[PDB]
Each structure stands twice: as structure tokens, then as C-alpha cells.
Swiss-Prot record, chains A, B:
Coiled coil: none annotated. Expressed in leaves, flowers, roots and guard cells. One of its GO terms (molecular function) is calcium-activated cation channel activity. It is found in: Cell membrane. GO terms for cellular component: cytosol; plasma membrane. This is Hyperosmolality-gated Ca2+ permeable channel 1.1.
Length: 651, 651
């Protein structure tokens, strides 16, 4: 745990990152990897073909250009696009996600300077003085960013083009009537209670079975489009087990091509059948609808007003953009939502515990490998531990997403925000306070050196490996080698994906926690946490501009969540110092360290009353302004046309 | 503290109450006291003159009719009026205030039976079992009453006649503009943002000086209408000190009549001056207005929607009925409200402490009188202590009201609810946990016997003295003897007042606290608490029907507050038993007594999501129904006429 030990591991992790950048340089120069490394430009119609014609030079013919700005030149170029241009290139969501990395640099750089000028040089009421200073600074910076992001969201919303969700609401829990269909009920309610501005509605149907059948047919056609063009004629005789196709030569059914072609044809038959049934039954129709209005002002009124005396019926909320709608969860009974949430809350409790064991044992196998085996030894025993941690936790965002989908959120945006909130609690317990303490199948917040190696593995070399985009590269390459069957591009496996708020934001928040909690005590984690923020800003800006494509636009609606998690980190820090310098210390240290959490909570409440309203409520003056200006620019728009078929199930 | 000691004091307090009922009988038979004891009937136009012609028989000629139903016959007669008739005689507010006494009887009677059948007969995990049972019962009964009162409020609101507040909102914090008056700003905002339904507005002015001058003139005219008709001609030569008139022969200025008549005339001159100034200046105009709408639906929309992007400007809330408006506080800058609230919060902290000292010393002077002086001795030493407590605390509701008026609430209803909330905190600390513990200029919740005597003094003999209405009787009699100058009634000093939510409800809640906290431990306070609830139901029903007149109609809007205070009592009880049977006891007692508060909080949250919405939000379907039915019954109403001058300052 000496400076030299940490310095050796730092060099290793820095070299790994630089090696990743050298491989990135090579791979991005290859003309056949252009659609993976520059996918956003292809999606924005600003890039044409792999090499201005397709697959030409830049490859192994010239390898790379050995220097310094041959593998690190993408960095200054990622910082060139102005933020305004990036709001219109990528989106507001992505631009404000980048601002969380910048917030970290603005919060932790001054606090690291203070900790490396007060603590270490004179190495104590200074611990409590610094704690105050650190909290004041973090809060000032949080307030300034709450303001900026609120104003950005408001400007974006005012200039955003017509989207169907600006006029629509989702009415849920429409009370059942024996003589009226959901559609009739909905129409009548909104023609009597919102008489002047109701335009149209779209009842939610359960086309989940039909959707599943359509997806099966794509999988069945894709599965053996491969073995239909492996060599055509009499192709493969793969014989998997009977479950979901998959496997391959692990059962008995040899046969031939197109996933036994009859399979695709029988799926198509069941699709036709279900298409008739789901349209003609009214049993598929759910007690919910998507009600659209003539104005955005009216939709705002509906979204923020109570409709009936029963607080659980006619529940109106702003609808999501039709591309953000997670349609499978719109067919879940509202009654089940509460129980589903409870079941997933208790499964989350078990998940946490299960993982504590592996993490403690990750650190245990580190010591065990040490036993099995000086500089090198310690180095590897520590690094390997962090790699194990990373491997166990790359599997966490996916589990948390399935749990969020079970709970029943009907928007991809909200699912990603719930998954990020749950990951914070996992990180609060298992990657922090309650990990080594919950060992055995004083020492609550673990130890500095263990955390340092994780910051260097997950947040230095891990963020560098993100730029290499290996998983998407492999997938594209396998798709374009096996299931190609295209003249050129009718095979789009270029799908880049989004930033991954449910994965990326929890990482930022773990380093915000680590940084804030340890700062008054030790000043050692801070330098490593700062390199994360800077590297990640530049790697993610490059990826937001060149690769990732947003799947929704929430206009930074996640900011209240991000803010609240940094406030939590601040509070946890203060509480931990009231346990370190609360024991004995001074009698006057107690009132100081007890006022800090009160000030922080009061600040949070001020920010929730000044800046949070911009994210949770749409002002009616803003809505009216948008409406009036649109009705002047486009004096005659048929909004009924645009809004009617906007919320039909994609199938 | 023996049963006999408590029994002796019970008899004394019961006799005091019966003596009060015998005096009441006499005084209510006197024909000259009819306008004090039957004031509500005179106010409802259902009673004519003191003795069907005025001042005739029933007095000392026949005294009273010595029996049992001569002084206790008013009790069955108070219980005769059906509740529906009482909603239309007195109001919903008063009918649901009576239901808190009935809630107490429905909560504590079954729990007293259990405590007197589980505890004492077998006098322990029974303490923890009973605690569970008591909480389940209290919660069941709270949920049932939340439902009933919600449905009552909703039915009342649907049948309530046109009141100006059903169409009006109070916009606060209208942003200042250099070229526009508040009126112009308000009109323009609501004609562009609520275009179809804005009707009219009424800007708030500061006519506080004018109001004060008008009130001074009434006091100056009244002061010596007395000494102008004491004997007319050359009357009194009273010479008070120079401050606020008052006193009398305690200074120098002898002179003569009409408070030195010139005084009334000079006040009238200043009134005329201020009348010109306040109307013609626009400096008196405050940044607030009362905006009325064409429909109640539109006003509901405005009240429950955000208007602008600045969360502290254009703040709209339902207006109060013009008679509920506390006009002096509408002229307080919004900026000052926060600081005023803080100053009064810290003054409340000091108030509590100041009083702890007297209460501890109240029960110290009890012991000291004991020392100065067997059955009689103990009896008086205890009773006198309770009387002292009552005397120190009759002065608390008034202080708490001035504190609420300082904070800046602009409705008498809200002022009474804030004063009742503050009195709960006073009672939680000083008349309970933190009184003897905060002694000296284990034993947190004081002791049973001390509380028992207070229940019997404040809640038995105190509620009986309420029926006697002595203060209002004295005032009327002095007014009609001194400042009469009427042919018959142009002198209305019959003002009965209201129930006093700021005084009466905190008493109910102190006995709910005492009852709930002590119940699992001891079963002794419960019988006395139950007599309070029953006596108070009957005394207050009589007074709601015969005497008290409501000054506002909130349609039971205070119920969420009442509910939450019984939930607090429940939680405090559980926490106290986790301190009594948490110490040692069992290891399995801890998980049981730790789940109880969680269940109680979960119940509260369920009730806040199911039944609280009816009190805090006006459904839009309900508003539309009221509007449509009114527009059919009265097809052509000029609402502008009715709403325009409704919110002008009464001066």
C-alpha cells in the first residue's frame, strides 16, 4: 500500500489505456470498420460509404503513423465541437450527461487542492473545517449546474420540433363499464371534461403475443438465412435441442434450411391469426389510452390536473415519445404494479447480499493468489482483484434492467433511470459501506488502496476500452460475414446504441461517492478520481459525436436524480466523519458535524423548489408560447392527422 | 396515587361539573341571557326576542326545577338533530370537528376494554401483542373516518351554493414591470395564458393603515359613547395615560365626552385623507391579485397548474372565501414570509422552554403546598396543580395565534390550523415527553397520576365550564349596561364566536396522545380519557347547535392535519414501548416493535394517496358537473357582477 506500489499499478493501467488507444488507432483507420467507429455520421446522413466508395485504403497497407498525435489526436478533436452544435447533433440528454463528468472536475479539483494543501502538508479540527468547505463547494457547484441544465432544458423544449408527445397524455386506469368500450368511455370523458381541446385518442391494446410472434419470425428467418446462404442447395443439417432454436448440432432434428422453412411459414400463419384476433376482440384493449389534444397547453393542463374524485382512476400523465414507449409493459394491469414493485424490491435485497459474498471473496482470492505466489506479486494480486470485480459487475446493469422492466415502467427513459437508481444502492452497500462489514459468508467503508485499484481499472483502463468498441465490432463483423445477403447495405447491423445511462451514470456516482466520503479523511483517492472524470469526458464526447445514437430525448429529465445522488453522497460523507471524529475528538466537534447535514438538506430543498420544477412540470406560459408561434408559422396544420396514428402499437 | 385518592378527586371534579350544569340551567332560563345561550338561532333567524317579546319570565321567579332532567336534559336534546341537518344548520367544519370526539370513543373504547382484560386481570409479551392490536384498530378507524369525511366534503362541495372563491384564485408574486401596473400585468397574463375563461381580477392593495384608522374611530366612538351616555351633559372627567386611551383616571387630561370628541373627528379626517391616498397611488397596490374565472373548472385548472418557468412568480392558489381572508397579512412582502417563519420558529423554541419551567414548578408548588400543610391534603395538592396548569395554558392559544399571524398566512382557516399544529408540538414536549426531563431550571413521559388529574380538570370540569359561557356572558352584560344606546338591538354584542379549532382540537389531540402512549403500558388513563370524549361530544354538540357560529367554511379541510397527528401519536407510542420493552426484555421483542412503526407509516402513506387527494385537490370532473348544472338552472347569470367586487378590501 506504499506510494511505489500504487505508482507501479498506475503505470500498468496507464499503459493498458495507451495500448487500447494504439489498437483503436489501427482499427479506426481500417476502412471496413468505418460503420462501427463513425456510426453517428452515417445515421445523420453526413457520411456515405466506408471509404468514399467503400472499403479502400488506410488498412494494413499503411498501419498507423508512429508518433504521439497518431493515437491521441482524437482527443483534441473531440473537444472541438461547440456544445450548442452538439445539442443539435447528438441531443440534450447526451450533452448534459457529459456535464456530469465536468461537474466532477469542477467539484473535485478544488477540493483535491485543499486536501493536498491542508491535510498532507501538516500531516485536527482541520478535518472538520475541510468538511465544511468541501460541502459548501459541492453545493455551490450543484446549484449552479441545476440552474444551467434547467435553462438548457427550457430552451430546448421551446425550440424542439413537433413531437407527438407534446400534445398527448397517457390516461391510465379507465374505470370499466359494462355497456361502453374503453374508447367510448375515454372519448366521452374528454369531450365533457376537456371539451374545447380534446382532439383524438388511441386505446392501449395488448399486442404482446403478436409482437412476440413477429420477433420470432425475424429470428427464424435470420437464424437460417445464414444456413440458406452458407452455400445454398443442400446446406446445414444442424440439429439443436428443442427450446429456442439456438444451440446447433446438440439434439436430433437434422433436416435442412431456413430453420426448417415450415417454421417460418407456421409463424407467419400464427401471426395472421393473431392479427385478426387482437384487432377484433376488445379483450386485448387495456384500461388505458393515449389522449391527444389540440394544443400543448391543454395537454399540460390534463397532465398536471386531477380529473376525478377517485385518486386511482383516470390517471393522466404526459406521454412519452412513441419511440421511448416500452410497449410490453403497457399491457400490465395497474393492480399488479404494486406487487411487482415489492417483489423486485425484495429481490434487490437478496441480489445485494449474494454479491457481497463474491466481492469479499474477490478480495480474498487476491490474498489467496498472493499466498500461492514484492513489487510484481502485490501488483498483480491487486490488479487481478479489480479485474474480477469488473467482470462480476458488468453483469449487474442487465439484471437491474430486467428488474425494472418487471416493475412495469412504460418508457425506456424511466427504465434507465430506475436501473441507475438501483445501481446506486448496490454501490452504496456492496462497493462501499457494508461490503467487508458483511463479510464472514469499525471497518464499514472498506479501505483506500482497494478503491484506488478499482478506480484505475474500472475508470481508467475501462473507459479506454470503451473507445475500442469491441463487442459492437465483433457483432457487426459476424453479421456481415454470416447473415449478410445484401447488395450493399440492406443489412444494417451498424446499430451503435446509446450512452447507457443505466451503466455510465452509476459509475460516475460511485466515484462521486468515493471522492466525497474519503476526502475529509484521506486525500489519496482524489487524484485518481480526477483522471477518471477527465478521461471519461473526452472518451465519451468522442463517442457521443462519432458513435452513439440516442434512442430517446428526455431533455435532461434525469438531472434531478443525478443531483439527489450527489446530495446523498455529501450526507453520507458527513455522517462518516461524525463517526470518525465523533468518537471522542472534541465536545465542540459534535455540534459542527451535526449542522452540516442540516445545511445540506436545506440546500437540497431550496434546489428542489427553484430548479426542479423545470424538469417535473411544464409551465403553461411556455406551452402557450410554443402553440402560438407554431400556429403563426404553420397557420393550417392538421394535428389530427399527425397525432392519430402516432400511438398505435408498432406491430 | 391510590385508587381511593384518584376516586376522591374524580368525585370532586364530577361535582364541579354537575355544579356547572346547575348554574347553566339557572342562567339559560333567565330571559335576559337568551341571546348568549341561544345565539345561533338568533343568527339563523329562527329566534326572535329574549322571551317571545323580550325579557319576561323564567327567572328568579321560578328558579329551576329540582330533579335530574332539569340540569341534564339538554344532553339528550343535543343529540337529537340528525347530522345532515347539522351540516345545513352549522356547517361541515363543525360536524366533522364533532366527529373527532366520536373517533376517540371508537378508538379508545375497544382498546380500553382490551387493556382492562389483558393487562390488569393477569397483572410479558402481551404488552407487545396489545400494542399491535391497538395500532391496527386505531389505523382501521382512521381509514374509515378518512373515507367518510372525504365523501362528506365532496358531497358538500357539490351542493354548496355559489361562493366567490369557487371561481377565483390568488395570484401571488406578480413580477414588477416598469411600464405596467400590477392590474395591467395580471390582465395581460391571464388573457394570453388562460384566454377563454378569464373573467376579472382584483388587485391586492395595502389598506392596512386605513383599516387601522377605521378601527380606531370605532374604539374612540365606543370608548366614550359610554361617557356621553353615562349621564350626558357634563359627564366624566376621566384622564388616562397617553398611549391607547384605555386606563381611566391615570394621567392628567380631564376634559369631557366622546373621547374628547375632537379625537373622533380628527380620526375621521385622517380616514378621509388615507382614503384618497390609498386609492390614488399604485404604491399601495401589492404584487398580488385575485383572479376570477368564468368557470370553476378554469379556476381549478389555474390553481393546480404551473404558470411560468420561474417557480416563485405567478403563484396561483385557490382563494379563500372573502370572509376567511385575513386581510392584514395580504400586505406582507413574500420575501419577508420566509424570514418571518424562521423568526417565529425560533421563538417557538424559546416559548416551549419557558413554559417547561412553570409546569415543572406547577407540580413543584404542588409538593410545596403539601409540605406547608392524608386524603384531603393530597386531593387539593393535586387538583390545585392541575388548575395552575390550566391557568398557564389558557394563555397559549392566543400567543400561538399571534405567531401564526406574524408568519403571514392570509386565511383565518389556515391561521387556526397552524396554531393547532404548533400547540401539538408544545403538548408533545411540555405536557408530555420532555417536561420533567427538562426539569432542573428514564423518566421522559412523566407519570400517570399527574396526567389523570389533568384529564379530570381540563377535560371534565373544563368542558363543563364551556357550557356556562361566562366570558361571553360578562362581555354582553357589560356592553348592554354601559355602551348600550339602542332602542332594542342596534347593539349587537351577541357575537358567539366559533368552536375554536386552534384551542379545541389541540385538547383532543393531547388526550389522543396520552391515551395511545400509555395504553400498552398502563390501562389507567383510558377511562378518564373516554369520559372526556363523551362529555365533550355532548357539550360541543349543544354549543354547535345553540351558540357557536362558524366564521368560515373550509369543508373539513383540516382533516388531513388531524389524521396526521393521530398517526404521530401512534408512532410515538410504539417508540416508547421499544424503550420500555426494548431494554433487555426479549431478543424477539425487538423485531416486533420495529415493524410496528413501518406498518403505521405505510398505512399513513396509503391514506395520503387515497383519501387526502379529496382535501388538497379539486377534481375537474366535479368542477365541470357543478358548472353545467348551474348553467342549466340559472341559464343567464352575470358572474362578472358577482365576482368583481367580491375581493375588494372591506374598508
Amino acid at each position: 500500500a506504499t506510494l511505489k506500489d500504487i505508482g507501479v499499478s498506475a503505470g500498468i493501467n496507464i499503459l493498458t489505456a495507451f495500448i487500447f488507444f494504439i489498437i483503436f488507432a489501427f482499427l479506426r483507420l481500417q476502412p471496413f470498420n468505418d460503420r462501427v467507429y463513425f456510426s453517428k455520421w452515417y445515421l445523420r446522413g453526413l457520411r456515405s460509404s466506408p471509404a468514399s466508395g467503400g472499403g479502400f485504403a488506410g488498412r494494413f497497407v499503411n498501419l498507423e503513423l508512429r508518433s504521439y498525435l497518431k493515437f491521441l489526436h482524437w482527443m483534441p478533436e473531440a473537444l472541438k465541437m461547440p456544445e450548442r452544435e452538439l445539442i443539435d447533433h447528438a441531443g440534450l440528454d447526451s450533452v448534459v450527461y457529459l456535464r456530469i463528468y465536468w461537474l466532477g472536475l469542477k467539484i473535485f479539483a478544488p477540493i483535491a487542492m485543499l486536501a493536498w494543501a491542508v491535510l498532507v502538508p501538516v500531516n485536527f479540527w482541520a478535518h472538520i473545517i475541510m468538511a465544511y468547505a468541501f460541502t459548501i463547494w459541492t453545493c455551490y457547484m450543484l446549484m449552479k449546474e441545476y440552474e444551467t441544465v434547467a435553462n438548457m432544458r427550457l430552451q430546448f423544449l421551446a425550440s424542439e420540433g413537433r413531437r407527438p408527445d407534446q400534445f398527448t397524455v397517457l390516461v391510465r386506469n379507465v374505470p370499466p363499464d359494462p355497456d361502453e368500450t374503453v374508447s367510448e368511455l375515454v372519448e366521452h370523458f374528454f369531450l365533457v371534461n376537456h371539451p374545447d381541446n380534446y382532439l383524438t385518442h388511441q386505446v392501449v391494446c395488448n399486442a404482446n403475443k403478436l409482437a412476440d410472434l413477429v420477433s420470432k419470425k425475424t429470428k427464424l428467418q435470420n437464424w437460417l438465412d445464414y444456413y440458406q446462404l452458407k452455400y445454398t442447395r443442400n446446406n446445414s443439417q444442424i440439429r439443436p435441442i428443442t427450446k429456442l432454436g439456438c444451440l446447433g448440432l446438440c439434439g436430433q432434428k437434422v433436416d435442412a434450411i431456413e430453420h426448417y422453412i415450415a417454421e417460418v411459414d407456421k409463424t407467419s400463419k400464427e401471426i395472421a391469426e393473431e392479427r385478426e384476433n387482437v384487432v377484433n376482440d376488445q379483450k386485448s384493449v387495456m384500461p388505458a389510452s393515449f389522449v391527444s389534444f389540440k394544443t400543448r397547453w391543454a395537454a399540460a393542463v390534463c397532465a398536471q390536473t386531477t380529473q376525478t374524485r377517485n385518486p386511482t382512476e383516470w390517471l393522466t400523465e404526459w406521454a412519452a415519445e412513441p419511440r421511448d414507449i416500452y410497449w410490453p409493459n403497457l399491457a400490465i394491469p395497474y393492480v399488479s404494479l404494486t406487487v411487482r414493485r415489492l417483489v423486485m424490491n425484495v429481490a434487490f435485497f437478496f441480489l445485494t447480499f449474494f454479491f457481497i459474498i463474491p466481492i469479499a471473496f474477490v478480495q480474498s482470492l487476491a490474498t489467496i493468489e498472493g499466498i500461492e505466489k514484492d513489487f510484481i506479486k502485490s501488483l498483480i494480486q491487486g490488479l487481478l482483484a479489480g479485474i474480477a470485480l469488473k467482470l462480476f459487475l458488468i453483469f449487474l446493469p442487465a439484471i437491474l434492467m430486467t428488474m425494472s422492466k418487471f416493475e412495469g415502467f412504460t418508457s425506456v427513459s424511466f427504465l434507465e433511470r430506475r436501473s441507475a437508481s438501483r445501481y446506486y444502492i448496490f454501490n452504496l452497500v456492496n462497493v462501499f459501506l457494508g461490503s467487508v462489514i458483511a463479510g464472514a459468508a469499525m471497518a464499514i467503508p472498506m479501505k483506500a488502496t482497494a478503491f484506488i485499484t478499482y478506480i484505475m481499472v474500472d475508470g481508467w483502463a475501462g473507459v479506454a476500452g470503451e473507445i475500442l468498441m469491441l463487442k459492437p465490432l465483433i457483432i457487426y463483423h459476424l453479421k456481415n460475414a454470416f447473415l449478410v445477403k445484401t447488395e450493399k447495405d440492406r443489412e444494417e447491423a451498424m446499430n451503435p446504441g446509446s450512452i447507457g445511462f443505466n451503466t455510465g451514470e452509476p459509475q460516475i456516482q460511485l466515484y462521486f461517492l468515493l471522492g466525497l466520503v474519503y476526502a475529509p479523511v484521506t486525500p489519496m483517492l482524489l487524484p485518481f478520481i480526477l483522471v477518471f472524470f477527465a478521461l471519461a469526458y473526452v472518451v465519451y464526447r468522442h463517442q457521443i459525436i462519432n458513435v452513439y445514437n440516442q434512442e430517446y430525448e428526455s431533455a435532461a429529465a434525469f438531472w434531478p436524480d443525478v443531483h439527489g445522488r450527489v446530495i446523498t453522497a455529501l450526507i453520507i460523507s458527513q455522517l462518516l466523519l461524525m463517526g470518525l471524529l465523533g468518537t471522542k475528538h472534541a465536545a465542540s466537534a459534535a455540534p459542527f458535524l451535526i449542522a452540516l447535514p442540516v445545511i445540506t438538506i436545506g440546500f437540497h430543498r431550496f434546489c428542489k423548489g427553484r430548479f426542479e420544477p423545470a424538469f417535473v412540470r411544464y409551465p403553461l406560459q411556455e406551452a402557450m408560447m410554443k402553440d402560438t408561434l407554431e400556429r403563426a408559422r404553420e397557420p393550417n396544420l392538421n394535428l389530427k392527422g399527425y397525432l392519430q396514428d402516432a400511438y398505435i402499437h408498432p406491430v
